[PDB]
């Protein structure tokens, strides 16, 4: 079966690592010290291997971040629903991915994480309008309750499958 390399990007603290660890290990972590992990899953009846590359801890413009992005086939662009700044930063990460892959057509999913937390500052309509402007899906997640987590990563695999 095919292996899919998925890279998780977003501002520090939005939950890249907690999402990754929930996907792989089925546990929520209160802290993560920065990173790649593999797991076999079945998506739409089709077995595949996920290789998740977590950019947590990499400096904003590091050579290793660029290598991670070059290696990736699809990207999760994560913000936190309780952090307007991290939502405003999404364009930065999208631009970086486009530069590194040297393409305007890169499989991506927009992920609004921490949807369990009370203090929402980003509406689902704002996020869906950004996603719509990029032509990509939007998925709301909580690494803590597991809502949306599988759906985010699996939707990204579906996007890659549509790209090849
Ligand atoms: N309540 C809640 N906390 C989260 C969620 N995702 C991550 N966290 C927490 O937010 C902090 C940052 O998460 P981390 O995964 O290290 O963020 P990263 O820097 O983007 O990798 C930690 O204290 C995590 O427990 C979530 O969906 N809900």
How many domains, in total, are found in the chain? 1
Please give the distance, rounded to the nearest whole angstrom, from the Cα atom of residue 6 to the centre of ligand 1. 19
CA distance 61 to 55: 11
- Burial class of residue 126 in the structure, from the number of CB atoms within 10 Å of its CB (0-12 exposed, 13-18 middle, 19+ buried): middle
Report residue 158 as tokens. Answer: 């579906």
Query: From the alpha carbon of 20, which atom of ligand 1 is closest?
Result: 15
Neighbours of 135 (CB within 10 A): 9
Query: From the alpha carbon of 54, which atom of ligand 1 is closest?
Result: 21
Report residue 94 as tokens. Answer: 């999208």
List the residue whose alpha carbon is closest to atom 28 of ligand 1: 114
CA distance 114 to 112: 7
Q: What is the CATH number of the domain that holds 143?
A: 3.40.50.300
Report residue 54 as tokens. Answer: 């977590």
Number of residues that make up the chain: 164
Report residue 55 as tokens. Answer: 């950019």
Q: Which domain holds residue 144?
A: 3-163
CA distance 64 to 12: 16
CA distance 49 to 136: 22
List the residue whose alpha carbon is closest to atom 11 of ligand 1: 13
Integer CA distances (angstroms), 78 to 2, 84, 91, 107, in order: 25, 12, 11, 14
Give the closest residue to 21 by CA, choosing from 4, 34, 10: 34
Using CB distances shorter than 6 Å, the residues near ligand 1 are 10, 12-18, 29-32, 56, 113-114, 116-117, 142-144
Report residue 140 as tokens. Answer: 């709301």
Helix axes 149-163, 16-25, angle to 10 degrees: 90
Method: X-ray
Pairing of strands 46-54, 36-43: antiparallel
Integer CA distances (angstroms), 87 to 9, 18, 41, 93, 116, in order: 12, 18, 29, 11, 17
């Amino acid at each position: 079966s095919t292996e899919y390399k998925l890279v998780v990007v977003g501002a520090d603290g939005v939950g890249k690592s907690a999402l990754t660890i929930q996907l792989i290990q089925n546990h929520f972590v209160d802290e993560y010290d920065p990173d790649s992990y593999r797991k076999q899953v079945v998506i739409d009846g089709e077995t595949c291997l996920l290789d998740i590359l977590d950019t947590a801890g990499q400096e904003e413009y590091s050579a290793m971040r660029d290598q991670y992005m070059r290696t990736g086939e699809g990207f999760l662009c994560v913000f936190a629903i309780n952090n307007t700044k991290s939502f405003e930063d999404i364009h930065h990460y999208r631009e970086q991915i486009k530069r590194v892959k040297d393409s305007e057509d890169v499989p991506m999913v927009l992920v609004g994480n921490k949807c369990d937390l009370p203090s929402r500052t980003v509406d689902t309509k704002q996020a869906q309008d950004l996603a719509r402007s990029y032509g990509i899906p939007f998925i709301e997640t909580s690494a803590k309750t597991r809502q949306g987590v599988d759906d985010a990563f699996y939707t990204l695999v579906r996007e890659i499958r549509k790209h090849k």
